Design a protein around this ligand. Structure first.
Ligand SMILES: CCCCCCCCCCCCCCCCCC(=O)OC[C@H](CO[C@@H]1O[C@H](CO[C@H]2O[C@H](CO)[C@H](O)[C@H](O)[C@H]2O)[C@H](O)[C@H](O)[C@H]1O)OC(=O)CCCCCCCCCCCCCCCCC
Ligand SMILES: CCCCCCCCCCCCCCCCCC(=O)OC[C@H](CO[C@@H]1O[C@H](CO[C@H]2O[C@H](CO)[C@H](O)[C@H](O)[C@H]2O)[C@H](O)[C@H](O)[C@H]1O)OC(=O)CCCCCCCCCCCCCCCCC
Ligand code: CLA
Ligand code: CLA
Ligand code: CLA
Ligand code: CLA
Ligand code: CLA
Ligand SMILES: CCCCCCCCCCCCCCCCCC(=O)OC[C@H](CO[C@@H]1O[C@H](CO)[C@H](O)[C@H](O)[C@H]1O)OC(=O)CCCCCCCCCCCCCCCCC
Ligand SMILES: CC1=C(/C=C/C(C)=C/C=C/C(C)=C/C=C/C=C(C)/C=C/C=C(C)/C=C/C2=C(C)CCCC2(C)C)C(C)(C)CCC1
Ligand SMILES: CC1=C(/C=C/C(C)=C/C=C/C(C)=C/C=C/C=C(C)/C=C/C=C(C)/C=C/C2=C(C)CCCC2(C)C)C(C)(C)CCC1
Ligand SMILES: CC1=C(/C=C/C(C)=C/C=C/C(C)=C/C=C/C=C(C)/C=C/C=C(C)/C=C/C2=C(C)CCCC2(C)C)C(C)(C)CCC1
Ligand SMILES: [Cl-]
Ligand SMILES: [Cl-]
Ligand SMILES: [Cl-]
Ligand SMILES: [Fe+2]
Lengths: 451, 334, 81, 137, 38, 342
């Protein structure tokens, strides 16, 4: 046993994995075994979801998060997002589950049987954290891998059946993407959009042409960047800016994953394109707008003139103006006027919600959809009692959007903490004071008094 | 040294009475702007249409508030999550009506307080300290982010951010209870354990160290003079302290290791408050407290109320009364 | 140390487990039967699911008199027929 | 108090005939009502039109009358407005619109009877709570 | 509106540039112990 | 002198795994019964006859909703002794009347006295100053003010807190709707002392852990401490410089620091207790009179203060009929305060 107690390693059991920092073989095992765990869950969770799945209920009434991801890719679904074939879901689950055994095998082998360090075994697989060129090479390999991943999505969309398009003319459907957006003005334009209301940065992406085009760009950027990093070593200015150690690199990635976590939270909360409401349920903004739509329809059927109906405050009860004048739904949902959805858009004119369209053109499928979304708003208790906090037990419902937003906020937050923990530790360790202040060389004692 | 080199040396100087540093370069102007705007608004701001229903709420001292009722009032529900800087308004009079000061203040504050956290790492590095004081500060900071940014994001409006005022804070709490049943949420319960426990352990540690101070003074002087700043020897007897507390409960429930004890003192409140922050930040996406409304039913099907159902009645009172002119439709969906 | 046998000694010994593989399950089963026989309801006066209300009653049997409170409860119990 | 055969005895039709549901039918009715209806009709109200509830007195004054098994079973096949004047299958779950309300696809005649029986039995248990809304929570 | 906006934009850009160039100016070396971290 | 008293004293004060002492004679039975009574009630005992509530695991409650509930309002402030004129020796009836509530409250109170006596007794034997016992006066002031003085000023024990998670939450919301307790400057000082105490706990723990001297080679630094060591384990000088430069001020005196850590949460709790003594008499900080005079005359004047009173009025009207069943409240739908739509 090498380095497997506190005396020899300097790390207590509860920091046990830090004993692995300079043992590239065992650390490869840890990583491969862990990748096994992720793949295991993806596979097993899918099979669990499928076994529990009732095809004629909406997915979002069934506590499903993985089947919705598969369906968005265009597998197993048809018009309106109706399930036409569960077999693609079965395949995804089984293939992940089988693959996890392989990863688990390699992980266990490297972790307990294989060479503890890889450097003496191989110059290609061995590494020194402080070897800047080797670090950028491995980074380079992984960037190429990621670029290929992004192009796999492009391949599915363009050449292997397409993607589920909630926006498809005549109703949501799986659609092949033949004209992906290549224009860098549009693609990178998203990146420079404000993250505030009515703009929403990248979260605002609202058509599959832009999504696919983005991944073409990202795929090429990642492959080019990967080649770049294999062929180069870090420049002088980068050398002087960073800490070059295993723990430092971990900290950079923790920071990055934290950022991505918060982005994913906002993506699933607001976006209804890559998170189709057919599969994930209505967004918070969507369901609130759907309520206003529902009662506008109801009261207009009863004879209300919804354009001229003045609410208790003086603002229109059903319809009012946004701060820039667009006609929008009234009541509290005034906040949600940036919402856009396939069931609502046919009522939209140049100036916002069109009163003549409202009076004459609302179709029964719009009433149904608005009623459905209003009554599946993403509100519910921790024990999955659907609805407002004062609602009685009866409906077993928490929106997948809530499950996915909350989990990813928690994860992103703790990852920011991990970033700070490890970035601060990497700095201190590099400078040589992570274990405490040298009693005979206490820096503050050589500094002038503040006063 | 050139000018830039000199400037860098001053910024990062360990000799400045207050440390500046690179985080401080952002922190100083942002915190000053937030502070100045807050003070002026709290004294002199006119009423603000918080709920976008042309029903302005007075927050400032000169407009009929005292210290307890006063606030800087959140920006208008008509704005929602839209960015409303001064230059987006047609006039200062419009900016004020719509609650522009709130956005200016909370955005500068959140930026400044994040830099305050970075600055804590930064100085610890310059002084050769271990780096994690900033991780402890991440707990209140995360809590401020929860109530000023994450909750507004989830609900779709800064009008639902916590007001900057004493009574406005209570308003936020009561409405939060109505809409999320926060009391019945385990993350808020962990928060309570965090702060009640933090206070308990604070008093406990205070009392035990104070109890075992080594006699260095006479009765006509404060025992505090028995300790001199920078002395090498510990000022209390930890063995006597542990001897006491280990007998109060039992030996193995007491810390004999000061490093372990002080780590526990850091960890208990910080972790609890992280859960508090995460409670707010996840109820922001309407995953709410436990709902046991009508959970207990008799053999016929009669509802047998529990204390959960009495809570529910209180929550209903809050719900039906809050923002009494703002709802037109039967469900409060955000 | 205070003179008592260390806990870790005790709970890793065969004799402890010979004794306690009997006493622990015995207590657990006794607790179970305290409920399953219905004795718990009788000792504490807790309503069974069919004993909160008479068939047509929807009013709570609230105690309203301090000194005749015992009789009131007894009267409430009689009215369950 | 108990869920007795009498509690479970509800009007079959408008002509004075009753049916006594079994305890298992009552359980099935609750389950199926939760499955297909409670998203809008939790506790006997109607979320998308609170003016109309599932109270027995309300169902009795509906056209055709809906305060009996037959009336309710017919409602679930061919729902109408409260005055019987328009057929609303296009916007209300029914067997006739099982194509657009897919949860109705697996409901059998037996299931409809169980749901109907739930709607009639629940107010006999819950009184004003059924169709009462938050006031009676 | 416009002059204020431009002024704040310039002010913000100024301080952000200080932050970025500042941390780029050999920050790992600004500690009391081991300076050779390049 | 070597009589039975001194021999008993000897045995009581033997150094054993669980110290006993003279204080143990009060403490151990009272604490055991208080805890046992709570577990017994929450497991098996109803609140049907006192409150019209289920409150035990037996009835289907969970850990959050179980409680030992207060007696019926009609009991007034009856001691509700098992052998008293209400229960008349009947253990079953005693449970149904809320006897376990006064059982737990009263044994709880004597148990707390025992615990504080224990703190004094042990401090005396070990030869330390009794600041731990002194600090414990805050928990006692809270327990006594809230569980005893408050209901004693009200109509009955019914309005004391019931011993339960959800029940305590109900008690919080009752105090908001009826007492506007958030507005009370004694509660506000309590909040500052609790949150200030939690702040001090976190910041001091973190400061010590981050100004540690390197006293070992290990990267895990806990082993590099010895209980008997003379030296400070962390640098007060470095800590002081850090906070002086970060925050503007810093502790420089360790004795003061630790006394302050006693002072803050202890003083907070004592302040909250004083406010609750006022609430026993409905002597609330409910209103600002100037606010009300203005708002009554001026229907455009609105503050967060007036908004919170509307919430309070909702709480009162919506919760009172079920929360106060002895009043037999019937509030027709039409009288219930509600805003638009909701
Ligand atoms: C190194 C880092 C550098 C940082 C330096 C500081 C630079 C400033 C950064 C901005 C801060 C974010 C504030 C605004 C966040 C927000 O309102 O985010 C929301 C936006 C999404 O915005 C929404 O985007 C929507 C897009 O949907 C639209 O398009 C859709 C297409 O399907 C639909 O049709 C939909 O209905 C339609 O409305 C709309 O535009 C909405 O109106 C709009 O509000 O998310 C997004 O842009 C992306 C997500 C932002 C991250 C979330 C912030 C969390 C960080 C807190 C961390 C805690 C710290 C703890 C410290 C201890
Ligand atoms: C410090 C920390 C140390 C640690 C603490 C140790 C804990 C020890 C435990 C002590 C327990 C004391 C319980 C006292 C019970 C009580 O009081 O019970 C109350 C009874 C009076 O009974 C009440 O009397 C009321 C008024 O009745 C009177 O008025 C009625 C209406 O007009 C009728 O005429 C009626 O017949 C007439 O008696 C109502 O009837 C109530 O229902 C009834 O309960 O007084 C009495 O027993 C005695 C009253 C006088 C002595 C009170 C001393 C102790 C209490 C101090 C707190 C004061 C509270 C003020 C609030 C601020
Ligand atoms: C994702 C979770 C994870 C992973 C992948 C690892 C990985 C590893 N750890 Mg860490 N660790 C973890 C979590 C994890 N740890 C947690 C949560 C704690 C706190 C309790 C620790 C505390 C800890 C300490 C203190 C140490 C490690 C060490 C190690 C390494 C050597 C382990 C060893 O010697 O086994 C010996 C154990 C066995 C031989 C028993 C069997 C173990 C195998 C792997 C179980 C496989 C089961 C699986 C179902 C089989 C499937 C096979 C199938 C595919 C065919 C290994 C790379 C050691 C190290 O750093 O050495 C240099 C070390 O000292 N860990
Ligand atoms: C991204 C993560 C994620 C998300 C969003 C979901 C979402 C969902 N799951 Mg899935 N699942 C996950 C991961 C996730 N799961 C994992 C890791 C497992 C393996 C255990 C499972 C296995 C699983 C099963 C078997 C089932 C679900 C089900 C469900 C649904 C109901 C969940 C529920 O009732 O929660 C209840 C809430 C809790 C249990 C509380 C979790 C609180 C944790 C402990 C706090 C975490 C804090 C933090 C991470 C710790 C840091 C500590 C700090 C000091 C550092 C919901 C759609 C159910 C379903 O409907 O399937 C169709 C179901 O039956 N899941
Ligand atoms: C990140 C993953 C990873 C990495 C970097 C390594 C690296 C290493 N392995 Mg381990 N191992 C892994 C995972 C990994 N392994 C997995 C998943 C398994 C189970 C199948 C194993 C089981 C294993 C055993 C039994 C042994 C090794 C050995 C070795 C060493 C020599 C390998 C060699 O010569 O290949 C040269 C190249 C080839 C033989 C051709 C590779 C063909 C690949 C598979 C084509 C497909 C690539 C594709 C992009 C993968 C995508 C997967 C993705 C979906 C997850 C080297 C240190 C040996 C050792 O350490 O010696 C003592 C050894 O005996 N590995
Ligand atoms: C995992 C992804 C990854 C990682 C970890 C790295 C890591 C590294 N890169 Mg590589 N690179 C990548 C992918 C990656 N690269 C890809 C995909 C490409 C192709 C575009 C490149 C092309 C590239 C070049 C040309 C260079 C590097 C360089 C470097 C080094 C320093 C980078 C740095 O200072 O960043 C910090 C970033 C900056 C200093 C930029 C300015 C910072 C602004 C103010 C931040 C604004 C972002 C903000 C958070 C908001 C986001 C939205 C915004 C767009 C509006 C470091 C080893 C350098 C190197 O030394 O080469 C050998 C270098 O010259 N990379
Ligand atoms: C030190 C431990 C201790 C203390 C302080 C208490 C205190 C209390 N108990 Mg608890 N109890 C204890 C241990 C204790 N108990 C134990 C070990 C058990 C298990 C048997 C119980 C079981 C118990 C029950 C079931 C109840 C109590 C109750 C009470 C309360 C009223 C008691 C009373 O009125 O006594 C009066 C008696 C004395 C104060 C003793 C006086 C001694 C004097 C000095 C001597 C004079 C006596 C003389 C010789 C007799 C001659 C009389 C002659 C003229 C006929 C009070 C809070 C009641 C309560 O909680 O109701 C809500 C109640 O119902 N206790
Ligand atoms: C051997 C060890 C001996 C040491 C024990 C010392 C005695 C003190 C123990 C006090 C524990 C009190 C918790 C009891 C919970 C319980 O039994 O619930 C029992 C309930 C029973 O479950 C309920 O049963 C009912 C039966 O009709 C219904 O079925 C309900 O639906 C169901 O919820 O279980 C739960 O509620 C699940 C959660 C329990 C987890 C407790 C939460 C932890 C928080 C406690 C914090 C306090 C600190 C304690 C530290 C130890
Ligand atoms: C290193 C380490 C660790 C870890 C480990 C790991 C992480 C692992 C792994 C692993 C793994 C990751 C594994 C695995 C696996 C798997 C498997 C074994 C599989 C399988 C499968 C199958 C058999 C299938 C089947 C089926 C089908 C085909 C169809 C349908 C149905 C079923 C399901 C039946 C720990 C922490 C302990 C510590 C020490 C060290
Ligand atoms: C797919 C997609 C897309 C696209 C995308 C893209 C194109 C992108 C990108 C991207 C990117 C392009 C990015 C980025 C980035 C960056 C970053 C994130 C950064 C950073 C940084 C840092 C961290 C730094 C640092 C520092 C400083 C500041 C100073 C000094 C020191 C240091 C160095 C430390 C779209 C939307 C269209 C749509 C959908 C899909
Ligand atoms: C009242 C009374 C009495 C007494 C009694 C007693 C003393 C009792 C006891 C009792 C007891 C003494 C009981 C118990 C118990 C218990 C239990 C029931 C438990 C439990 C538990 C649990 C459930 C746990 C869990 C948990 C936790 C908390 C922590 C962490 C994790 C877990 C989740 C694991 C007498 C006769 C004098 C008289 C008259 C009245
Ligand atoms: Cl309000
Ligand atoms: Cl509304
Ligand atoms: Cl009605
Ligand atoms: Fe200390």
């Amino acid at each position: 046993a090498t380095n497997r107690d506190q005396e020899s390693s300097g790390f207590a059991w509860w920091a046990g994995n830090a004993r692995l920092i300079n043992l590239s073989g065992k650390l490869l095992g840890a990583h491969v075994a862990h990748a096994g765990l992720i793949v295991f869950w993806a596979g097993a969770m899918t099979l669990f979801e499928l076994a529990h799945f009732i095809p004629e209920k909406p997915m979002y009434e069934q506590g499903l998060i993985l089947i919705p991801h598969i369906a968005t890719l265009g597998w197993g679904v048809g018009p309106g997002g109706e399930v036409v074939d569960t077999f693609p879901f079965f395949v995804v689950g089984v293939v992940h589950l089988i693959s996890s055994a392989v990863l688990g095998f390699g992980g266990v082998y490297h972790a307990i049987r294989g060479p503890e360090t890889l450097e003496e075994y191989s110059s290609f697989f061995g590494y020194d954290w402080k070897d800047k060129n080797k670090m950028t090479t491995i980074l380079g390999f992984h960037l190429i891998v990621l670029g290929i991943g992004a192009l796999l999505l492009v391949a599915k969309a363009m050449f292997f059946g397409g993607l589920y398009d909630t926006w498809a003319p005549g109703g949501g459907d799986v659609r092949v993407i033949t004209n992906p957006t290549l224009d860098p003005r549009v693609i990178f334009g998203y990146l420079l959009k404000s993250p505030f209301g009515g703009e929403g940065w990248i979260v605002s992406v609202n058509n599959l042409e832009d999504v696919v085009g983005g991944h073409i760009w990202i795929g090429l950027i990642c492959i080019a960047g990967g080649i770049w990093h294999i062929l180069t070593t870090p420049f002088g200015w980068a050398r002087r800016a960073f800490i070059w150690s295993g723990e430092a690199y971990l900290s950079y990635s923790l920071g990055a994953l934290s950022m991505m976590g918060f982005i994913a939270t906002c993506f699933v909360w607001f976006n209804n394109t890559v998170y189709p409401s057919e599969f994930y349920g209505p967004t918070g903004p969507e369901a609130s707008q759907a309520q206003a739509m529902t009662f506008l329809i109801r009261d207009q059927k009863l004879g209300a003139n919804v354009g001229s109906a003045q609410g208790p405050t003086g603002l229109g009860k059903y319809l009012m103006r946004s701060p820039t004048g667009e006609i929008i739904f009234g009541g509290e949902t005034m906040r949600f006027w940036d919402f856009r959805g396939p069931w609502l858009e046919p009522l939209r004119g140049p100036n916002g919600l069109d009163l003549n369209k409202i009076k004459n053109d609302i179709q029964p499928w719009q009433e149904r959809r608005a009623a459905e979304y209003m009554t599946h708003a993403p509100l519910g208790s921790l024990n999955s009692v659907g609805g407002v906090a004062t609602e009685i037990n009866s409906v077993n419902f928490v929106s997948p959007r809530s499950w996915l937003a909350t989990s990813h906020f928690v994860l992103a937050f703790f990852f920011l903490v991990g970033h700070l923990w490890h970035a601060g530790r990497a700095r201190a360790a590099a400078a040589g004071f992570e274990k405490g202040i040298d009693r005979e060389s206490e820096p503050v004692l050589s500094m002038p008094s503040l006063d | 040294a050139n000018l830039w080199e000199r400037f860098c040396n001053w910024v990062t100087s360990t000799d400045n009475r207050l440390y500046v540093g690179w985080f401080g370069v952002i922190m100083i102007p942002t915190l000053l702007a937030a502070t100045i705007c807050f003070v002026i608004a709290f004294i002199a701001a006119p009423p603000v249409d918080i709920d976008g229903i042309r029903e302005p709420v007075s927050g400032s001292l000169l407009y009929g508030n005292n210290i307890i009722t006063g606030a800087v009032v959140p920006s208008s529900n008509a704005i929602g999550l839209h960015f409303y800087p001064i230059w987006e308004a047609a006039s200062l009079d419009e900016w004020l009506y719509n609650g522009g000061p709130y956005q200016l203040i909370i955005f500068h504050f959140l930026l400044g307080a994040s830099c305050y956290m970075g600055r804590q790492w930064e100085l610890s590095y310059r002084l050769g300290m271990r780096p994690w004081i900033c991780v402890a500060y991440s707990a209140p900071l995360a809590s401020a982010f929860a109530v000023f940014l994450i909750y507004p994001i989830g609900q779709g409006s800064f009008s639902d951010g916590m007001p900057l005022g004493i009574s406005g804070t209570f308003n936020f709490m009561i409405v939060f209870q109505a809409e999320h049943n926060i009391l019945m949420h385990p993350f808020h319960q962990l928060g309570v354990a965090g702060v009640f426990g933090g206070a308990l352990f604070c008093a406990m540690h205070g009392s035990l160290v104070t109890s075992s101070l080594i006699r260095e003074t006479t009765e006509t002087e404060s025992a505090n003079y028995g300790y001199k700043f920078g002395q090498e020897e510990e000022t209390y007897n930890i063995v006597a302290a542990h001897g006491y507390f280990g007998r109060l409960i039992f030996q193995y429930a007491s810390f004999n290791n000061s490093r372990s004890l002080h780590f526990f003192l850091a960890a208990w409140p910080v972790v609890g408050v992280w859960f508090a922050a995460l409670g707010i930040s996840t109820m922001a996406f309407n995953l709410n407290g436990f709902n046991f409304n009508h959970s207990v039913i008799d053999a016929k099907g009669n509802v047998i109320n529990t204390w959960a159902d009495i809570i529910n009645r209180a929550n209903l009172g809050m719900e039906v009364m809050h923002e009494r002119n703002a709802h037109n439709f039967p469900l409060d969906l955000a | 140390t205070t003179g008592e046998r260390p806990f870790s000694d005790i709970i890793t010994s065969v004799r402890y487990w010979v004794i306690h593989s009997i006493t622990i399950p015995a207590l657990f089963i006794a607790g179970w039967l305290f409920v399953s026989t219905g004795l718990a309801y009788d000792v504490f006066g807790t309503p069974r699911p069919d004993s909160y209300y008479a068939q047509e009653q929807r009013s709570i049997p609230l105690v309203t008199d301090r000194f005749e409170a015992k009789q009131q409860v007894e009267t409430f119990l009689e009215q369950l027929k | 108090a108990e869920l007795t055969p009498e509690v479970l005895t509800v009007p079959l039709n408008s002509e004075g005939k009753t049916i006594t549901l079994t305890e298992k039918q009552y359980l099935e009715g609750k389950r199926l009502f939760q499955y297909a209806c409670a998203s809008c009709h939790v506790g006997g109200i109607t979320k998308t039109n609170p003016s109309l509830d599932l109270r027995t007195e309300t169902l009795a004054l509906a056209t055709p009358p809906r305060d009996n098994i037959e009336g309710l079973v017919d409602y679930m096949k061919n729902p109408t407005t409260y005055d019987g004047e328009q057929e609303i299958a296009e916007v209300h779950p029914s067997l006739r619109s099982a194509d657009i309300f897919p949860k109705m696809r697996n409901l059998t005649e037996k299931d409809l009877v169980a749901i109907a029986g739930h709607i009639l039995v629940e107010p006999k248990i819950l009184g004003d709570k059924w169709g009462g809304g938050k006031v009676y929570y | 509106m416009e002059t204020l906006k431009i002024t704040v934009y310039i002010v913000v850009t100024f301080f952000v540039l200080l932050f970025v160039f500042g941390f780029l100016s050999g920050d790992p070396a600004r500690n009391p112990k081991r300076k050779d971290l390049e | 002198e070597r009589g039975w008293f001194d021999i008993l004293d000897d045995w009581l004060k033997r150094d054993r795994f669980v110290f006993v002492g003279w204080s143990g004679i009060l403490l151990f039975p009272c604490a055991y019964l208080a805890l046992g009574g709570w577990l017994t009630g929450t497991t098996f005992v109803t609140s049907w006859y006192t409150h019209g509530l289920a409150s035990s695991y037996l009835e289907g409650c969970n850990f959050l909703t179980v409680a030992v509930s207060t007696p019926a309002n009609s009991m007034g402030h009856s001691l509700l002794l098992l052998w008293g004129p209400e229960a008349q020796g009947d253990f079953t009836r005693w449970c149904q009347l809320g006897g376990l509530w006064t059982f737990i409250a009263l044994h709880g109170a004597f148990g707390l006295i025992g615990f504080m006596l224990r703190q004094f007794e042990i401090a005396r034997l070990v030869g330390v100053r009794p600041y731990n016992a002194i600090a414990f006066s805050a928990p006692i002031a809270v327990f006594v003010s809230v569980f005893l003085i408050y209901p004693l000023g009200q109509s009955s024990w019914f309005f004391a807190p019931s011993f339960g998670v959800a029940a305590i939450f109900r008690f919080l919301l009752f105090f908001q709707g009826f007492h506007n307790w958030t507005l009370n400057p004694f509660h506000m000082m309590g909040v500052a002392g609790v949150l200030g105490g939690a702040l001090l706990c976190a910041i001091h723990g973190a400061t010590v852990e981050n100004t540690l001297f390197q006293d070992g080679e290990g990267a895990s630094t806990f082993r590099a401490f010895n209980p008997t060591q003379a030296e400070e384990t962390y640098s007060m000088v470095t800590a002081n410089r850090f906070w002086s430069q970060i925050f503007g001020i810093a502790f420089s005196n360790k004795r003061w620091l630790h006394f302050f850590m006693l002072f803050v949460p202890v003083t907070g709790l004592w302040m909250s207790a004083i406010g609750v003594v006022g609430l026993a008499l409905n002597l609330r900080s409910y209103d600002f009179i100037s606010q009300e005079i203005r708002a009554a005359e001026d229907p455009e004047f609105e503050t967060f203060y007036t908004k919170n009173l509307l919430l309070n009025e909702g709480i009162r009207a919506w919760m009172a009929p079920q929360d106060q069943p002895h009043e037999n409240f019937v509030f027709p739908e039409e009288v219930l305060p509600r805003g638009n739509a909701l």
